[PDB]
Amino acid sequence: SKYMTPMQQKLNEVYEAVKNYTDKRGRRLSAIFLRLPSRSELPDYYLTIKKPMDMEKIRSHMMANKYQDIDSMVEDFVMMFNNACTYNEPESLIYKDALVLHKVLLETRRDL
């Protein structure tokens, strides 16, 4: 079944909060995180990041009704932002944006 159950609808609220967040200047910080480059495009990422994750993969898992609870999805987002902060250096834009969204995610969960 394709219909979103009540649990999926709650997961999708959290997913949308992260996806649609804009910073104080209107910048959509999620955009870079939708799609990780493939193994052929960025092989060194797959050497050191043991569990590659992007928001397309999370969303597909969510839409397939494969998350058992809100916490399971939050853990994949947390993994994704930790991966970004590991592969990318602290001076980088993506590292800074991963921190902001990681906090948005945690506060969204706490207030749910």
Ligand SMILES: CCC(CC)Cc1ccn2c1[nH]c(=O)c1c(Cl)cccc12
């Ligand atoms: C911006 C400099 C790019 C340097 C190749 C890094 C780059 C390009 C896209 N993505 C990343 N780094 C990520 O870690 C990452 C993650 Cl978690 C999820 C989805 C996309 C990602």
